[PDB]
Amino acid sequence: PEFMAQLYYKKVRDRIPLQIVRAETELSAEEKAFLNAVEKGDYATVKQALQEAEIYYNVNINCMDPLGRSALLIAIENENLEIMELLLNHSVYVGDALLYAIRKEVVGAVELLLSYQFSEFTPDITPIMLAAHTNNYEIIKLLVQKRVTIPRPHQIRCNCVECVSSSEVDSLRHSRSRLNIYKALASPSLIALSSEDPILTAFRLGWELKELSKVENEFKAEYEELSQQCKLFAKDLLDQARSSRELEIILNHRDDLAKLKVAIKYHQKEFVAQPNCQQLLATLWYDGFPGWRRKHWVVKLLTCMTIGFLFPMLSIAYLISPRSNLGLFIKKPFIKFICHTASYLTFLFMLLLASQHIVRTDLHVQGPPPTVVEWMILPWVLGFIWGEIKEMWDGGFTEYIHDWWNLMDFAMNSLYLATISLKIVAYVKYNGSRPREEWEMWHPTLIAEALFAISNILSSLRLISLFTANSHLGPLQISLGRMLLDILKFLFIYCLVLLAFANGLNQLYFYYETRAIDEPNNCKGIRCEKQNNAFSTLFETLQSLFWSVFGLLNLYVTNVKARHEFTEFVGATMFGTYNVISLVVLLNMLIAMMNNSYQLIADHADIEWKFARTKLWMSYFDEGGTLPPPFNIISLIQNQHYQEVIRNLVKRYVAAMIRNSK
Amino acid sequence: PEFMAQLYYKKVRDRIPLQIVRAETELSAEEKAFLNAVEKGDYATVKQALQEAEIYYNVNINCMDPLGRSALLIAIENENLEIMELLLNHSVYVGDALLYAIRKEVVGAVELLLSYQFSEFTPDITPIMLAAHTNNYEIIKLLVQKRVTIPRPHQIRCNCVECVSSSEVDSLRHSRSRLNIYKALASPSLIALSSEDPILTAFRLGWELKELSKVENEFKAEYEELSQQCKLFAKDLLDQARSSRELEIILNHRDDLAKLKVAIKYHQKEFVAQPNCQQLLATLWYDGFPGWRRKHWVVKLLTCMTIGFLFPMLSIAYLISPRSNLGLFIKKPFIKFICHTASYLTFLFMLLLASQHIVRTDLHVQGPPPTVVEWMILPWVLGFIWGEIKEMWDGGFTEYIHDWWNLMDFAMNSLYLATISLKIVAYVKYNGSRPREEWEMWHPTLIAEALFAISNILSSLRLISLFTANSHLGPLQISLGRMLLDILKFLFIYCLVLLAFANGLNQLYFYYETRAIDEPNNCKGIRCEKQNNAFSTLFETLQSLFWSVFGLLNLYVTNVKARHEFTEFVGATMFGTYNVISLVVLLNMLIAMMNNSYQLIADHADIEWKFARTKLWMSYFDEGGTLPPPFNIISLIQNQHYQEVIRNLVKRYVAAMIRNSK
Ligand SMILES: CC(C)CCC[C@@H](C)[C@H]1CC[C@H]2[C@@H]3CC=C4C[C@@H](OC(=O)CCC(=O)O)CC[C@]4(C)[C@H]3CC[C@]12C
Ligand SMILES: CC(C)CCC[C@@H](C)[C@H]1CC[C@H]2[C@@H]3CC=C4C[C@@H](OC(=O)CCC(=O)O)CC[C@]4(C)[C@H]3CC[C@]12C
Ligand SMILES: CC(C)[C@@]12C[C@@H](OC(=O)CO)[C@@](C)(O1)[C@@H]1CC[C@@H](C)[C@H]1[C@@H]2OC(=O)/C=C/c1ccccc1
Ligand SMILES: CC(C)[C@@]12C[C@@H](OC(=O)CO)[C@@](C)(O1)[C@@H]1CC[C@@H](C)[C@H]1[C@@H]2OC(=O)/C=C/c1ccccc1
Ligand SMILES: [Zn+2]
Ligand SMILES: [Zn+2]
């Protein structure tokens, strides 16, 4: 019989003889009696046993069970306060007994041990850290009353001698100690009890823990859980506000919604999207419309279009006399938003009018003067450039870059400046009226028109950022922008496959490159009626494979004039393999990946959209940037009140979490 | 070492010194003894302590624990009735102790406190409101027996001085109080106990709470949960009916299925789809077919086709003598449905015959007389118009608009009237027989034919509303109609992207617009053999991008006669970016969004379909609208019985929920 040998033992028949491999020194019969007495609760028996153990040495006071728990730990686990006290009086080893009492979360034993080998706890654990890991307000309060400390963690990217030495001598212990310290600090009970500003402490700690999660590639999930715990603590403190006065004291605290800007800076999405914060925000947003929420959608539409049609009137009123019954009407955030959206929509309307023929120049004049539509477009372009440079001046490139729409605006304005410069060059370097079919490939007028059309696409696509303000379009934009990332990752794999097959196809077909004269209509490439030279060059092959993704590459492009049937079959099979790999493997990768990411989105989409809409709204609360283009180019008592409100909220939160335990 | 400073404290080294930041005034040692005695249960100790506290002032009767719970609250939490009574006799502060007793849900303590700082409850909470939030029948009954009140909530869109003042002084408190009142009113135990009509109260309250959820944009989920709680209460009351007499007493109550029409009006889908309600409905529906359920599908098919083939016979019998053995056969809802479906199918068959050549006119006569097929079509068209105007007359535009199929019928009838009017105009304004290739672009005959073909599409698509009557097609229609909404939202984003890229492409290519004479077959646009001028105008560009979505736009359209290689590459790259953005980004948005919405559908699809089928069935229970086109154009004891049935159902429901607690 063929047996499975060397399963449990190295020795080289039909049975597995089981013995205790790691045998450990057992206790005496009287020691076992001592531990049985301390487990059972026989106070007199334990008293007699250790009283006689005091006389001689035959009995051990610090006798340790095979499971590692001495008599004191069994007394702790059974909450035998009297046996605990009797053991402590007679000098039982009291190492790490406080930690077991704290983890059991019994206040009496913790008080008793606070008033006077193998461990279940890593050596770095202290009583305050372990109590904070249990989030027990009573025990944490007991330990903080007898003034304790928690070691201060270093910066994430620290290079001091301590850090470089601990992480090189013992990396596992150093990482564990760091995580334990952060678990203690991120404790809602410890923040509530011992933080001067619990809400700011939760903000900063959640931020730093998210950053650690990024940096500490392993142990990422624990740091993410700690960050979420801090965020939920801050949001649950905000949940405890009972009046609008408390909420405005919290949100306006600075150390006009200062604490809310701090929350937006730290990406405290849950805190910001808290319903009372959002209700206060919507009250500030609809300043001129107290009854906006209770209006009918037709009334809303007529009011919005009325304010939009009058944005030049409101802007001119603000310019002429800002402090007037009409000057400061555009100072309202919602009116300001309507006026800015109207200004931008008129800009896009003029962009549309540019390509029409309402007023038009001859298409055969090289370097023409600007059209009156282009003349009217220019003030908006200058206003957008001025607004973006003002934004970067007021925010720094570190905040300018953080916005993707801001980079898109940068590209838009760069293309518009290039269009103006190319139009100037064409105007001052060409005088005649050469027919357009005679113009060179890189004529500045042709390049100016191309750049202007790209600018038009970008400007019109800039409207998707206004979706955030809508209850229905906002979450859609959040989901779309969040799956753009897996689109990018799939784009990486797709471009690698594309480049591989372009290499192969071009290596095959680059011999049969025909000259453009030899083609039917003197047309070379795949943008002809008769597609030809699809894989003759690398750039063309890349275009051909891209367009094959959409079925716009015909099959006859895989055929050569020489009619080399083996080469034409190998090219057709490379093309077919590319079509299989891309169209029905990687595209379905994209579909499945999008479905997964979209489920993960739809879980949190409401909070994400509310945070984005709060950012959008806050962008209109400030005085700077009131006028839309083209018109933009022409203390101690506060801390006392915050501390009282925080006192009340911490009390309410502590009571709430204590009840939620029960 | 770089430390993370200012984590817990503002002060600007390697340790975090933890102190109690919000220190609160502790109690005396004797006060702590008093609270320890009241927690422990030492009746004699507490009695002695407060008896001696009566003499001097050294002890405080109203001593309050750091956790905010005084001695009375600890007695309540431990259900110490005797200590509670002794404390109440000696004048302990009794503020908000009833609320803690109610939340603990102990009847003895509530009775004791009903017979004689920091709070865990918001100040607006009253005993009856809190008891209703706990849904405890015993406690609610105790509090209602001692006559109490709940403040009456205002209308959703209220503008009185009270509302405008409370919401401006304290919006958070006002919103909280409104939600608390609605949480109390939506309590199944309070509705069962104190509502004259529990089922109608649940209907109205669920409706109003859904409307509040709509209006109160924040706190939407709480109002939605309250609405669902009301709906489930009504459905669970209906679940308690044990005989068909009780069910017919409930459903026919009016204050012929009056309560069921009220349930349909309030969108009480769960109540309507309750199996016994549906069984009664199916009994009323198959009036002429008692054994319909137990028949074989072939027998059903033969019977249905027999009744359908005889719809003119049944309609004429109803016309000649409505009160006869054959006149009132079409008065049965299922027979009526079969006859209406047959009438409409014959109408669609004649619409199909219209485009055939069984009988046909010369295609070169402008303004021809109607074909005999069109002559036969006319009575159905008149009947449909008459039926829709009768429906709007009997239902008001407010109910007419609520149906989407009703708007589709409006469009159908408008197009049919336009077709008749255009045919009349062509007949009375053209006499000759001009060849059809000579006709003008806007010839009334051509427009009449176009409108008639659109009407044919709409009429044939109107059959999808009959899917509701089928067990398999009905849920499919429900799912399809529910994902049409995310289709619409994606249509918004898609049209924005479409317009952006159409702007760019037209701005690029509008210079190279060739004249239609210069094209191969004198054909301009993308509906030619040689597609050309794809992006020459804005409307054409919009069509070209739309058709590129389906691959019907060829690539050579991105090429100009002038052979401007940079412009042709920029156009091809705009076209490629549009194809990437739309075809493999937004379409996959649609796929993932549809999958999510379809999961949410499939959860409730059965209830949704049963509600829709009940509406369809109820549309055939009424005498008005018996004849299908073209033939349609030629009390106190009841309340007593309802109250007895409601008494029995409320008793059964109360017992059921009490047991479900255990
Ligand atoms: C999509 C095609 C047909 C091009 C149409 C372009 C514009 C006419 C549309 C596209 C996106 C729309 C915007 C989408 C988002 C909104 C939200 C809308 O209502 C709100 O919810 C904001 C007010 C609030 O926060 O209460 C105000 C208008 C606005 C900017 C819309 C204005 C009209 C816009 C610019
Ligand atoms: C799909 C193509 C081939 C065109 C065929 C058109 C009609 C012949 C079909 C399409 C939808 C069918 C309807 C789909 C729904 C039903 C349910 C069917 O059986 C039922 O469940 C209703 C009776 C009941 O409630 O018990 C009765 C016929 C009817 C109207 C069908 C009649 C035949 C219809 C009109
Ligand atoms: C959109 C634009 C950036 C494109 C579109 C081409 O334009 C043309 O070929 C006409 O000249 C061009 C020049 O630039 C490149 C040639 C090779 C490939 C990288 C193409 C680029 O395409 C993608 O980067 C991504 C494509 C994709 C995404 C998802 C699913 C399937 C495909
Ligand atoms: C269907 C009909 C309403 C269309 C179809 C066009 O007809 C033609 O172009 C021939 O003349 C036309 C005239 O009217 C419009 C031109 C531009 C675009 C809005 C088209 C419309 O199309 C959609 O509204 C939506 C399209 C879509 C939806 C989902 C996924 C992908 C695309
Ligand atoms: Zn064997
Ligand atoms: Zn360091």
Curated annotation (Swiss-Prot), chains A, B:
Coiled coil: none annotated. Its main location: membrane. GO terms for cellular component: calcium channel complex; cation channel complex; dendrite; growth cone; neuronal cell body; plasma membrane; presynapse. One of its GO terms (molecular function) is ATPase binding. Disulfide bonds join 523-528. It is a multi-pass membrane protein. Residues 355-374, 425-446, 506-573 are extracellular. It comes from the Eukaryota. Activated by G-protein coupled receptors via direct interaction with GTP-bound GNAI3, which increases the channel sensitivity to phosphatidylinositol bisphosphate. May be activated by intracellular calcium store depletion. Calcium channel activity is enhanced by MYLK, that promotes its subcellular localization at the plasma membrane. Glycans are attached at residue 431. Expressed in brain with higher levels in fetal brain. Found in cerebellum and occipital pole. The chain crosses the membrane at residues 334-354, 375-389, 404-424, 447-467, 483-505, 574-594. It catalyses: Ca(2+)(in) = Ca(2+)(out). Keywords: ANK repeat, Calcium, Calcium channel, Calcium transport, Cell membrane, Disease variant, Disulfide bond, Glycoprotein, Ion channel, Ion transport, Membrane, Metal-binding, Repeat, Transmembrane, Transmembrane helix, Transport, Zinc. Ca(2+) binds at residues 388, 391, 406, 409. Forms a receptor-activated non-selective calcium permeant cation channel. Mediates calcium-dependent phosphatidylserine externalization and apoptosis in neurons via its association with PLSCR1. Acts on distinct neuronal populations in the hypothalamus to regulate innate behaviors including feeding, anxiety (flight/fight/fear), socialization, and maternal care. It is linked to Loss-of-function variants in TRPC5 may be involved in a mental disorder characterized by maladaptive behavior, anxiety, autism, postpartum depression, extreme food-seeking and hoarding behavior, hyperphagia and obesity. Homotetramer. Heterotetramer with TRPC1 and/or TRPC4. Each subunit in the homomeric ion channel (via ANK repeats) interacts with one copy of GTP-bound GNAI3; the interaction is direct and activates the ion channel. Interacts with TRPC4AP. Interacts with NHERF1. Interacts with MX1 and RNF24. Interacts (via C-terminus) with CABP1. Interacts with SESTD1 (via the spectrin 1 repeat). Interacts with PLSCR1. Interacts with PKD2L2. Belongs to the transient receptor (TC 1.A.4) family. STrpC subfamily. TRPC5 sub-subfamily. This is Short transient receptor potential channel 5. It comes from Homo sapiens (Human).
